[PDB]
């Protein structure tokens, strides 16, 4: 047990990071392009889709940096300021993406309960909500903004981009932040999204029980259930790992094998959250029946230009 752990996995991590990066950087780019200059704005849920796609886009834009970081086996070349900026930027876009998923589920719930709310829906109120969500994500990324720095790890002989908690009370701090990551990153959003899904399913189930209404209603129900299932699938492993890590920092679990498994699996789970950010555009923007026709129109844009 007490023997030093394995390093076999680090060969595959950067390549996977690049795969996820190119996939999400294409898909999210497609979404943001359809929204940005091409007409299609002026809807609240649409504004939310755009902001989520921007958060995921700028989020995966940092994946090459982490793939290089894992390629050089934790030796950070770009400097301490870059470690600060891109760590806090990463955390900020994680919180923006997750908070935007929650905000879109809340928007769907409050649009299902209230059938008489127009699509404009006081668009300036969304022009106030979007900065509110971004500011909440910033405030939640303040710990990562204060502790993500470059420190010299002598035993690895490596200038690593880590969380630079006070080494006297390092472990404690780690545990704390881990729990915070669980609460502000999974627990509260999971509660919101789950309750919203349950309520939406209930109201729908009442409204459109018979006929073609039942068919389309079951489709939309599978859409909301698919939202919750995607979030859970691509965020439960990471947060379970961070919770067990928090237990280790506390000292409840000290087994060498368990902690070695935590550190072995953690980069994969981080990548899994990033794959959630990559998958969201398929789940939210590409589902509309107007999307495929708009895609065929974009595809024929240069042909008509000829």
């Amino acid at each position: 047990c007490s023997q030093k752990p394995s390093d076999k996995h680090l060969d595959a991590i950067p390549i996977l990071y690049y795969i996820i990066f190119v996939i999400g950087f294409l898909v999210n780019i497609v979404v943001v392009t359809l929204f940005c200059c091409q007409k299609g704005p002026k809807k609240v849920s649409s504004i939310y889709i755009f902001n989520l796609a921007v958060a995921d886009l700028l989020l995966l834009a940092t994946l090459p940096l982490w793939a290089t970081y894992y390629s050089y086996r934790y030796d950070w070349l770009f400097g301490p300021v870059m470690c600060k900026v891109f760590g806090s930027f990463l955390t900020l876009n994680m919180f923006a993406s997750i908070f935007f998923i929650t905000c879109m589920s809340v928007d769907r719930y409050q649009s299902v309960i209230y059938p008489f709310l127009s699509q404009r829906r006081n668009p300036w109120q969304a022009s106030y909500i979007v900065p509110l969500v971004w500011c909440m994500a910033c405030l939640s990324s303040l710990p990562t903004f204060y502790f993500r720095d470059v420190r010299t790890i002598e035993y690895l002989g490596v200038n690593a981009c880590i969380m630079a908690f006070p080494p006297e009370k390092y472990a404690q701090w780690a545990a704390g932040i881990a729990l915070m990551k669980n609460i502000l990153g999974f627990i509260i959003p999971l509660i919101f999204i789950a309750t919203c899904y349950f309520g939406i399913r209930k109201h729908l189930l009442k409204t459109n029980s018979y006929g073609k209404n039942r068919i389309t209603r079951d489709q939309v129900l599978k859409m909301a259930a698919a939202v919750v299932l995607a979030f859970i699938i691509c965020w439960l492993p990471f947060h379970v790992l961070t919770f067990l890590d928090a237990l280790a920092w506390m000292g409840v679990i000290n087994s060498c094998e368990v902690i070695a498994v935590i550190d072995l699996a953690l980069p994969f789970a981080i990548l899994l959250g990033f794959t959630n950010s990559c998958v969201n555009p398929f789940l939210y923007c590409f589902v509309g029946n107007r999307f495929q026709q708009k895609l065929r129109s974009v595809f024929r844009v240069p042909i008509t230009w000829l």
């Binding site: 760590g87 994680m94 780690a174």
Partner: peptide
């Protein structure tokens, strides 16, 4: 000793 070396 041990640190959080991961990006998130």
């Amino acid at each position: 000793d041990r640190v959080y070396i991961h990006p998130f």
